C-alpha cells in the first residue's frame, strides 16, 4: 500500500548552513599549465582546508566534499595508488586544525594506512565545535541508499520494525549523510551533473555550477555562489 496526502513532517524541520562540494577541474587545471595530472590532484586537500576556514568565518556549519568517487577505481593502478597515498595527507592538514572531520564511504576497501590516518583524523578533531567537514571517500549516492536498505532489512528480520514503520525519517537515520541536507551544491570545472555524489540528500538542494576550476576557486568565487543563493531565495522563497 501507499498514502502521500496526509504525510506532513519534512526532514529535520539567508546563509546556507550546509554546502556540498564537487571539487572538479584539477586534471584540466594541470593540463592547461602543461603539468602532470598529479600536480592538479595535490591542490585538492589544501584548497579544501582553505574553503573550510573561509566558510567557518561566514557562519557555514557543514561542508560535504566529494573527495574520491567509486569511479576512481577504473583508472590506472599508478593513478589510484597516487590518490590513495595522497589522502593520508588529510591527517597533516586537519589533525591540528579547528575543523571537525568525519569520513563517509566504504573504509574497508582503503589501505589500512589510509584507514588508520582517517581514524586518527576523526579521533583528534572529534572535539572541535566549529565547521564540520564530511569527506566522502569511496562513496556514492547508490551506495548510501543500498547500505541504508540493507540496515532496514536486518532490523525487520529481527522484529525491530514493521514495513508500515518505513518512512522518510526512519530511512534518513540509516544514511551516512543525514539531514540537515545540503542547502547549496557547488560544482567547479563546468559539468552540470551530480555524478552519483548524493542522491537522496539533494532533493531540495540549490544547484550552482561554475566554470571556475577547483584550484582557482577562492574566497571571491565562494561569496559569489552564496550571493547567487541569496537572490534565488528573494525570487522563489
Amino acid at each position: 500500500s501507499c498514502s502521500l496526502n496526509l504525510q506532513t513532517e519534512k526532514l529535520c524541520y539567508l546563509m546556507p548552513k550546509h554546502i556540498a562540494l564537487i571539487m572538479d577541474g584539477n586534471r584540466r587545471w594541470a593540463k592547461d599549465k602543461g603539468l602532470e595530472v598529479y600536480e592538479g590532484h595535490k591542490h585538492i586537500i589544501p584548497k579544501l582546508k582553505e574553503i573550510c576556514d573561509i566558510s567557518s568565518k561566514l557562519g557555514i556549519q557543514i561542508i560535504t566534499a566529494f573527495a574520491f568517487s567509486t569511479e576512481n577505481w577504473k583508472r590506472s593502478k599508478e593513478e589510484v595508488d597516487f590518490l590513495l597515498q595522497m589522502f593520508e595527507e588529510i591527517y597533516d592538514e586537519f589533525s591540528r586544525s579547528g575543523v571537525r572531520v568525519s569520513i563517509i564511504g566504504c573504509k574497508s576497501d582503503l589501505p589500512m594506512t589510509l584507514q588508520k590516518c582517517i581514524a586518527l583524523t576523526e579521533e583528534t578533531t572529534k572535539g572541535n565545535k566549529g565547521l564540520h567537514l564530511v569527506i566522502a571517500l569511496n562513496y556514492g549516492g547508490y551506495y548510501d541508499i543500498l547500505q541504508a536498505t540493507k540496515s532496514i532489512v536486518n532490523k525487520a528480520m529481527n522484529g525491530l520494525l514493521d514495513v508500515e514503520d518505513i518512512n522518510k525519517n526512519l530511512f534518513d537515520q540509516e544514511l551516512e549523510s543525514k539531514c540537515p541536507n545540503p542547502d547549496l551544491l557547488i560544482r567547479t570545472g563546468g559539468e552540470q551533473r551530480v555524478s552519483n555524489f548524493l542522491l537522496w540528500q539533494l532533493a531540495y538542494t540549490e544547484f550552482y555550477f561554475t566554470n571556475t576550476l577547483f584550484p582557482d576557486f577562492g574566497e571571491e568565487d565562494l561569496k559569489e555562489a552564496i550571493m547567487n543563493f541569496q537572490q534565488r531565495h528573494r525570487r522563489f522563497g
Side-chain angles (χ1 to χ4, degrees), residues 1-5 7-237:
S1 184
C2 62
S3 183
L4 304 189
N5 67 313
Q7 303 212 268
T8 322
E9 270 275 26
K10 177 69 103 247
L11 266 69
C12 280
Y13 322 133
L14 68 99
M15 190 64 32
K17 190 206 166 149
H18 182 172
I19 296 176
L21 270 183
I22 301 173
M23 311 177 283
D24 199 25
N26 312 291
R27 298 158 185 283
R28 177 53 161 75
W29 182 92
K31 283 220 157 200
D32 89 27
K33 302 292 144 153
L35 306 179
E36 300 185 58
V37 57
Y38 306 113
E39 296 300 310
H41 288 322
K42 291 179 185 172
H43 277 82
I44 298 168
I45 293 149
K47 179 56 78 180
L48 187 52
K49 176 54 158 53
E50 181 192 320
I51 295 163
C52 289
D53 291 330
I54 300 154
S55 300
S56 201
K57 292 173 170 68
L58 305 171
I60 296 163
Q61 264 107 72
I62 306 164
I63 295 181
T64 307
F66 202 16
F68 188 91
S69 76
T70 70
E71 308 293 44
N72 278 298
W73 297 116
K74 300 217 180 79
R75 313 177 169 279
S76 38
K77 263 232 169 161
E78 194 199 324
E79 172 143 23
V80 176
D81 283 17
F82 181 86
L83 276 173
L84 291 179
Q85 176 72 67
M86 190 191 70
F87 279 114
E88 294 185 3
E89 268 131 62
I90 281 167
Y91 181 74
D92 313 63
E93 274 273 11
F94 289 105
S95 58
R96 320 228 336 290
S97 84
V99 179
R100 180 159 62 99
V101 179
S102 314
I103 288 58
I104 62 174
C106 180
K107 291 163 162 154
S108 89
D109 296 334
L110 310 189
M112 301 285 340
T113 29
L114 182 43
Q115 297 201 42
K116 254 220 200 78
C117 283
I118 287 157
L120 273 165
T121 308
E122 299 192 5
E123 198 65 22
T124 58
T125 64
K126 72 185 286 174
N128 293 324
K129 294 195 48 161
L131 190 144
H132 181 199
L133 174 64
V134 180
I135 304 179
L137 263 185
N138 193 34
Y139 176 89
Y142 300 139
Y143 156 81
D144 208 356
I145 288 165
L146 290 167
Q147 70 75 31
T149 296
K150 286 169 169 190
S151 176
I152 288 155
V153 169
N154 278 322
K155 289 185 220 288
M157 292 190 324
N158 309 339
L160 262 122
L161 55 88
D162 316 315
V163 138
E164 310 312 0
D165 299 348
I166 294 170
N167 61 26
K168 259 186 286 259
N169 311 295
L170 191 135
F171 195 91
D172 200 79
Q173 281 297 316
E174 300 304 306
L175 293 162
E176 286 176 31
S177 183
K178 310 180 175 55
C179 63
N181 291 326
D183 305 282
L184 172 65
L185 185 141
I186 298 168
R187 175 168 188 154
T188 59
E191 298 294 319
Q192 297 204 358
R193 304 183 303 263
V194 304
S195 297
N196 186 34
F197 181 21
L198 307 155
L199 296 176
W200 170 278
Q201 297 92 350
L202 293 189
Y204 296 105
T205 313
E206 290 292 336
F207 296 168
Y208 183 84
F209 307 111
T210 177
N211 286 328
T212 305
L213 307 181
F214 190 62
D216 302 321
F217 188 83
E219 168 171 13
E220 184 183 62
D221 303 296
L222 182 54
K223 298 167 157 187
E224 194 180 336
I226 286 165
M227 291 179 71
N228 183 285
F229 169 88
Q230 294 177 333
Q231 279 315 86
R232 293 177 191 199
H233 189 250
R234 290 175 153 94
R235 186 179 175 192
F236 294 121

